[PDB]
Amino acid sequence: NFMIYPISKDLKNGNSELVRVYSKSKEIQYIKIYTKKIINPGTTEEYEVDIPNWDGGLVVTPQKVILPAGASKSIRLTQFKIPKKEEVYRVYFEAVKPDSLTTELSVNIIYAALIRSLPSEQNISLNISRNAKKNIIIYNNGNVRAGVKDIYFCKSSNIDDNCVKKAYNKNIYPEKSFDTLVNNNFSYVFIKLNHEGIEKEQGLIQLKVPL
Amino acid sequence: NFMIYPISKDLKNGNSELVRVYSKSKEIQYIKIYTKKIINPGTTEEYEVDIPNWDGGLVVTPQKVILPAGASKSIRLTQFKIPKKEEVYRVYFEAVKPDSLTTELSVNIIYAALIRSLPSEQNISLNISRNAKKNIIIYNNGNVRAGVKDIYFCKSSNIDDNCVKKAYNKNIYPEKSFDTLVNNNFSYVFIKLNHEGIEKEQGLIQLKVPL
């Protein structure tokens, strides 16, 4: 058995970060590390693609770890080129047999760290639109993901108890859209954003264009 | 999270057996089940091949399970044809997303049950041979695996404290060979077999042919 930490990392400015591997067993273990970029993150059409550890936009090294009893080891993460907009990868960690059974359990635990490759000058920015049913839609026009916690739909430009508060703990990635599922005739919206990496940036009011 | 039991099953006489799935989480889970036959089991050249669940020599059903909070479910195992000699499969159980993320951990635990497809009239039988260096070699001439716990190498036909006892907890599958790594000039060997499925069958003496 083994463990990884942290379980997610932000990389920025070409600064390298570690995801570490902690031995949790009396045996020595052999861990393989491989990486997938996430296409269309946070959406319906999300999928993962295999990328080599040493030639992509994210350098992950080493790709094999020999993990002695009680030891800790590190995998280093480095942006190769800094992206204009945030990109996400999952780095997988998988124990294998050394390259070189009725009685006991077979168990294969594979851990993944979610890795965010961030742009250098971060810009959270959201746009509002309406559907076939006005059914208001949020569009990420910025260069990083927007973690939306709740949205306040108001009939006025003032936040208050009249507004209906729907909780949406959804991350919206750059150039992606979110279906709020609300087609009613509000005038303004207030997006409540999750806080990431020392950003505070609490309140966003966007005017909902009339239908 | 979820759990499986038992972790290994013997199937015999066309009698169906269960490997069960136990929900260990507050969420509902979707489990996929797929099967691999093990080629050259217990040896250097061991590898696994994908087999369909419903057309091989081992029928595994269902291949998808919807696992509600706190529930238990079953996968049924049935030999389609009974083999002349033991064959082994691994049945894998893997939670997936329903067919129809910085903050929280990504963890993919895949469990496997080792499944032995056994012949109807079981016959444990071993043969002895010598190497380039006499280096005595055990050959499984029977129709089931031989679980060898220890071997007593004697210079006489009598078991006793003169004999050197080497512990070998190795399963030797039918038509396969084991390298004892002992080239010294003994006369007899006594194989200590593990006990499987109500077999007792404790002591096997094979005469070591002179070099």
Numbering used by the authors:
A (entry chain A), B (entry chain A): 1 to 100, 110 to 220
Sentences copied from the publication:
The CFA/I pilus is the archetypal colonization factor for enterotoxigenic Escherichia coli, a major cause of life-threatening, dehydrating diarrhea in young children of low-income countries and in travelers to these regions. The three essential components of this pathway are one or more pilin subunits capable of polymerization, a periplasmic chaperone that catalyzes proper folding of the pilin subunits and shuttles them to the outer membrane for assembly, and an outer membrane usher that orchestrates ordered tip-to-base polymerization. Upon export of a nascent pilin subunit into the periplasm, a β-strand in the N-terminal domain of the chaperone fills a hydrophobic cleft in the pilin to provide the missing G strand in an otherwise incomplete Ig-like pilin subunit, a mechanism called donor-strand complementation (DSC). In this work, the crystal structure was determined for the CfaA chaperone of CFA/I pili, which represents the first atomic resolution chaperone structure for the Class 5 pilus family.
